Design an enzyme around this catalytic site. Structure first.
Site, mmCIF file in Angstrom:
data_model
loop_
_atom_site.group_PDB
_atom_site.id
_atom_site.type_symbol
_atom_site.label_atom_id
_atom_site.label_comp_id
_atom_site.label_asym_id
_atom_site.label_seq_id
_atom_site.Cartn_x
_atom_site.Cartn_y
_atom_site.Cartn_z
ATOM 1 N N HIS A 176 1.056 -1.109 -0.009
ATOM 2 C CA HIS A 176 -0.103 0.040 -0.048
ATOM 3 C C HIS A 176 0.776 1.223 0.072
ATOM 4 C CE1 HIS A 176 -3.985 1.510 0.455
ATOM 5 N NE2 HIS A 176 -3.713 2.008 1.340
ATOM 6 N N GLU B 2 -14.350 5.145 4.720
ATOM 7 C CA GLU B 2 -13.188 4.369 4.162
ATOM 8 C C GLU B 2 -13.092 3.222 5.113
ATOM 9 O OE1 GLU B 2 -10.084 7.159 3.506
ATOM 10 O OE2 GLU B 2 -9.519 7.416 5.785
ATOM 11 N N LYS C 131 -4.054 7.257 -3.894
ATOM 12 C CA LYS C 131 -2.906 7.931 -3.325
ATOM 13 C C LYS C 131 -2.121 8.738 -4.087
ATOM 14 C CE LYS C 131 -3.976 6.823 1.115
ATOM 15 N NZ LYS C 131 -3.824 7.935 2.201
ATOM 16 N N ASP D 129 -5.955 11.570 -2.522
ATOM 17 C CA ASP D 129 -5.397 11.998 -0.961
ATOM 18 C C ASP D 129 -3.681 12.096 -1.342
ATOM 19 O OD1 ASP D 129 -4.561 12.298 1.447
ATOM 20 O OD2 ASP D 129 -5.202 10.510 2.095
ATOM 21 N N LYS E 3 -11.736 10.591 12.350
ATOM 22 C CA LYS E 3 -10.831 9.560 12.889
ATOM 23 C C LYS E 3 -10.842 9.294 14.212
ATOM 24 C CE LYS E 3 -8.241 9.536 8.499
ATOM 25 N NZ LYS E 3 -6.572 9.308 7.951
ATOM 26 N N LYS F 62 -10.527 5.932 -3.788
ATOM 27 C CA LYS F 62 -9.651 7.025 -3.254
ATOM 28 C C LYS F 62 -8.133 6.686 -3.605
ATOM 29 C CE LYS F 62 -7.330 8.160 1.261
ATOM 30 N NZ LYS F 62 -7.644 8.659 2.782
ATOM 31 N N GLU G 52 -8.245 15.053 -0.785
ATOM 32 C CA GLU G 52 -7.979 15.260 0.687
ATOM 33 C C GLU G 52 -6.513 15.792 0.907
ATOM 34 O OE1 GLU G 52 -8.458 11.193 2.094
ATOM 35 O OE2 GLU G 52 -7.870 11.644 3.848
ATOM 36 N N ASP H 200 -7.548 16.479 6.788
ATOM 37 C CA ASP H 200 -7.292 14.897 7.457
ATOM 38 C C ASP H 200 -6.236 15.181 8.450
ATOM 39 O OD1 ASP H 200 -6.931 12.448 8.570
ATOM 40 O OD2 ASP H 200 -6.056 11.498 6.572
HETATM 41 O O1 LIG Z 1 -5.299 8.042 4.032
HETATM 42 C C1 LIG Z 1 -4.915 8.261 5.415
HETATM 43 O O2 LIG Z 1 -4.281 9.407 5.508
HETATM 44 C C2 LIG Z 1 -4.656 6.993 6.059
HETATM 45 C C3 LIG Z 1 -5.394 5.801 5.505
HETATM 46 C C4 LIG Z 1 -6.957 5.894 4.883
HETATM 47 C C5 LIG Z 1 -6.987 5.299 4.015
HETATM 48 C C6 LIG Z 1 -5.867 4.902 3.626
HETATM 49 O O3 LIG Z 1 -5.649 4.282 2.479
HETATM 50 O O4 LIG Z 1 -4.924 5.415 4.292
HETATM 51 MG MG LIG Z 2 -5.224 11.368 4.608
#
Ligand SMILES: O=C(O)C[C@H]1C=CC(=O)O1
Ligand SMILES: [Mg+2]
Ligand SMILES: O=C(O)C[C@H]1C=CC(=O)O1
Ligand SMILES: O=C(O)C[C@H]1C=CC(=O)O1
Ligand SMILES: O=C(O)C[C@H]1C=CC(=O)O1
Ligand SMILES: [Mg+2]
Ligand SMILES: [Mg+2]
Ligand SMILES: [Mg+2]
Lengths: 371, 371, 371, 371
Positions: free
Chosen positions: C21, C326, C168, C197, C272, C166, C223, C248
């Site tokens: 991931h 999520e 990254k 994000d 969260k 979502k 995000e 976040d």
């Molecule tokens: O996104 C984040 O900051 C933390 C987490 C939430 C889902 C994910 O994929 O990582």
């Molecule tokens: Mg995040």
């Protein structure tokens, strides 16, 4: 590399203090330090210190968690790295470790100590060069008794030990705390500078009145009167208070210093290596404050000699510390782990030009007090 | 002191350039540098450089006045002082000399060079330690002809010399300058990054439209589009412009960096040792920018090898230079005063680990070109 | 008390994940949880979970330091206290422990689980009452390969597992990351909602352009595009971005939620439990957001079933979660410590009405994976 | 459902008061309450109260219209609904009914009372758990005569009934009202806290002067000095007033609390279940205030025992109520409808741990006083 880091040992040391130290949120009955012993391939050992107050009562890092995170995350990242390139080493930590400024401060202090010994230069010179050899040192009155505090301050004056006094308030009723502070300043008069630290204890509703009263009664500085979370309130208080307000807890990183300066949250900033991530990061915070016209104060988290000197060496390079310093940590400890304690005389801390932090460990004290 | 400063000689040197360099306010036909030779009691000589653009067309200090003020005010203050304590020396100047950042930059560069030789360390290490050995270097297109600029950029790409191009605009009609920039980016496509520098030439009334057009046509950065005096306008343009705006002339001291960051006048800051007062002051400006989330750019005032390397050594210590650098000064000069020129290859400037600035004077060139 | 806390055991568990991931700052190869087993005098055991991402790469608390601080500071404060009064217990921690929200979240989750079993009510009912039985669950695409991500999303759609994705980004070159996101949305079209994000990776100078491009290409939410430290920048981006921005990392406590809402730093808040200090604190943050007209998103720190359900039970009580959730943590883990995994089907997570968090430990898995 | 709501009866009750109560806009000669009797399928009856001041002289809801809207709109929506899920029930009302916070407060109070009896828990525990058993209670002086007020306050002190006094002003000439307040504080000295409530009566032009005078004469708090409509004025007064300003009428819903905190309209918030829509909504308003660093005050609309205890149970869960409470409603009434009145002694209201609101109806009093 010839100066590769070979090992990093963290040692928790519990040391006795000279008397109970009462803060708004916690009463100290002793002090715990985290000693960092960093050894390099060229046979040089650097010493650093990561210390806080009251376990987790003050900040999110405890001596216990500092040891845990350094051993589990910091050491793996640094062992094998060139100890002579401090900027690269600290940036390496920064890219993989969030927060943990107390731990980082101790690590950088140790690297600076080792580098100083390596080049035969005191840390102050590694940081650019000193512009002074001595730093004025304030003393905190926090016995919890007005009569005791006045007597203690009078003695420190007679001994030419301290002439600037910081009063811890916020644990009791506002008016009782105010009367306490006023009585002390009245007793000392112009023979000393009296300031207060509320450790975020007051609500803005209380602070807006209290600051007026203190400013109107000879109090020179009001440290962190309200919560660092009431950002808008700190800005408003800077306007209503006739006495300057200093930010301490509001600064938990260099970026906070910028934001506070941008918003106008305080006219003076406390400089603490533990809150910024070491001497170098603290100098960046000082640079921001200076650029904004904000006064400087040499702060402490009540470190022993190692952390106190690491802080001192950085402060020796500052153009001006308008509000002096509170580097009295070693004096609050009845016992420390240095072979020779820092030199305090005539209202100042005197820093030598010996290599590194100019200190050595007292093996006997370390052995007895280490956990 | 064993490292006392015994003499400081300033020498104005007029050097030929490879081609006319047209800026919005001035057209360069050559370049003039002010070489600083600082000699110490321990037999060490440090070299520094104070250089500007177009006499007084760019800034308030000319090569001529820089020599005058250093000889008349700086030298008297430093001769006899310990050259090994750079912070104290520069603070000594700061307490008696206002402004004159270009002069101060050259002086500090010389002190750093000497200190590096003294300790056998490159300046980058004196400043904390490098985190990279090479810096990306952009190239400025300012011949005044669209066809010539496109051809020149294409060649620099083929030679693997440069892949980031800075276009000087603002001297002509806005639409003609815009067409010029768009045509260049169109010709180069994705093979290069194209940016512009208006050198404060536009009024906000013009910039508000022009920035939209440039951002909508692949231009990556817009440097100082309007006057540093239109403070409120720069803030407004940062909001209306779809392309990031960089402050250059708006920064004439470290304090300006803070104020610009506080006001939100630009999202990227150019870092120039000449505008801040030397490598160390420039690192403080960088610290402020970083703390504010503002991107960094390694700027130049078109210095020769000495000033370029002094800048480079400081930049090597920065965590990140998101917008790269424009340290191509030595390449614009057909002749410089270094025995060995800086190393440029594969889109970068490569800095060695030799002591000080790692350079030496070419006595023949100095003798012929010195005024 | 009849429900006095008799013991609190913290167990670090290392569990395998289904695939790497990749986040902007760290690449996960597995996941580590901190299980909290809280036992009471009435024979009831409550289970809680404190989990983070990448050791210290994401936040200041590591699984290791969470265990250290709970064992050394939290347990001593709670053992002997009435477990049936959760508000008093959590306030007792708050008055002596600063920060450590991840640890606090796990502790409160365990207390809620035990209290639910004690009263025979699911946590959602202890928190006021559910208004829904199922929560929509998004899926994160972070393999680091565009082709792989598109294929994975298409399969999740076919399986009726997820329809909100979502992405990254932030680890690579901005334009490459942008092309990646655009290609994915193009391939999925209107069959799914695509969001990104950036995990604070971009500088405002980059974000101001990137957000425009993403918003103009069908991306529904952006995000945390920049550093939580660039407070003024987040406010400015909310105005220039045609796509809504979600905070976040900017939220590290309930007070941050208020300040962000006051300043206008984001139009959507991620909720969260780990960042606020548990389900109850998170509901206070939600109350602030709702009062400010800010949208809600059910966030995760990639917790296993325990932490995921603790989060879910709180979210079941919210009037509306405009941006969904999520809560897919248990799905990223190839193995978890629950006897029966949470129920996922038809794009949702289905929460039962069983007492407490409605789960039980798989003793075999706990024994094998616990550190 | 087993706990389905079977009936909701609203009863208007006119009760005698101990003496005329003079507010800036109205003079109370008695008090009218709206009792809510909510009966469930499991044979449990919950009691709630919706009460205001002076018909429509204070707010837009009268006891008469509260009964009309509950009978015509609320009852139809709730009869048949599960009474054990309070959050769902109140959200069901919120989606179809705008405003009517007084009515909603009474309804939620009744649901909480019934749920408490259902689980055998006091409301304070249903809301999370109490952190105190007693609440400090202020007393309002509003006879309209200075001599009478001073005598009354002195007696309440001697009886250990009250030591915090709230003075109603704004109906007369500003200077006469000011003299009145000053004379009372002068007579009581440090034996009591004296505050004022202007009920929005002053114009900012008057308040800017009056607040200075009051703050300079020992007045601890200034409640709603001007109109809630002069939003900018309240912000300005918070800066010019040396005494903290509390918002009351400015809060007519949870969202108002956020906006007031965002704007900086007051440093203390009065918490009234009638103005927010019940105990739960009031706790959300408290959460917002706390997150903003705003002090809390337990307010009242002069409810009898039912409404007073519903308010008290919520306040028992708050971390801190820096400005105490004014839960003296039952004491102003010469007759109430409770079989056993709330317990007042030693400056506090003492709340028991009996199920629900821990009270029962006095059938004789209800029968005689009901309209
Ligand atoms: O996104 C984040 O900051 C933390 C987490 C939430 C889902 C994910 O994929 O990582
Ligand atoms: Mg995040
Ligand atoms: O004041 C603090 O916040 C920390 C420390 C500094 C001196 C002292 O007495 O306590
Ligand atoms: O751009 C400036 O203001 C100064 C200098 C930098 C490169 C260049 O071409 O001119
Ligand atoms: O003050 C109000 O606005 C309402 C109520 C509270 C006590 C009191 O005397 O009147
Ligand atoms: Mg402090
Ligand atoms: Mg420029
Ligand atoms: Mg009122």
């Amino acid at each position: 590399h010839a100066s590769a880091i070979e090992s990093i040992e963290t040692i928790i040391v519990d040391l006795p203090t000279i008397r109970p130290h009462k803060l708004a949120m916690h009463t100290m009955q002793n002090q715990t330090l985290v000693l960092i012993r960093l050894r390099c391939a060229d046979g040089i050992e650097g010493l650093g210190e990561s210390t806080t107050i009251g376990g987790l009562a003050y900040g999110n890092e405890s001596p216990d968690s500092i040891k845990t995170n350094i051993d589990r995350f910091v050491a793996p990242l640094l062992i094998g790295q060139d100890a002579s390139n401090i900027n690269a080493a600290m940036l390496r930590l920064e890219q993989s470790i969030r927060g943990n400024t107390f731990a980082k401060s101790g690590i950088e202090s140790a690297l600076l100590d080792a580098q100083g010994k390596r080049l035969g230069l005191p840390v102050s010179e590694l940081l650019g060069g000193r512009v002074r050899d001595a730093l004025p040192v304030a003393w905190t009155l926090a016995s919890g008794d007005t009569a005791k505090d006045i007597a203690e301050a009078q003695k420190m004056l007679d001994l030419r030990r301290h002439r600037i006094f910081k009063l811890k308030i916020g644990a009791g009723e506002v008016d009782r705390d105010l009367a306490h502070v006023i009585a002390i300043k009245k007793a000392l008069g112009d023979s000393a500078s009296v300031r207060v630290d509320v450790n975020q204890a007051w609500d803005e509703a209380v602070a807006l009145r209290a600051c007026r009263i203190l400013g109107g009664n000879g109090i020179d500085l009001i440290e962190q009167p309200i919560s660092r979370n009431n950002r808008a309130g700190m800005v408003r208080l800077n306007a209503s208070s006739p006495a300057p307000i200093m930010a301490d807890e509001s600064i938990e990183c260099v970026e906070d210093a910028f934001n506070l300066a941008r918003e106008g949250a305080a006219s003076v900033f406390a400089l603490k290596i533990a809150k910024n991530g070491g001497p170098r990061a603290t100098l960046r915070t000082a640079a921001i404050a200076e650029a904004a016209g904000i006064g400087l104060y040499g702060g402490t988290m009540l470190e022993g000699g190692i952390g106190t000197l690491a802080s001192a060496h950085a402060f020796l390079t500052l153009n001006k510390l308008s509000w002096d310093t509170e580097l009295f940590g070693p004096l609050l400890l009845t016992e420390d782990i240095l072979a020779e304690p820092p030199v305090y005389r005539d209202f100042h801390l005197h820093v030598s030009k010996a290599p590194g932090l100019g200190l050595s460990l007292d093996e006997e004290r370390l052995a007895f007090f280490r956990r």
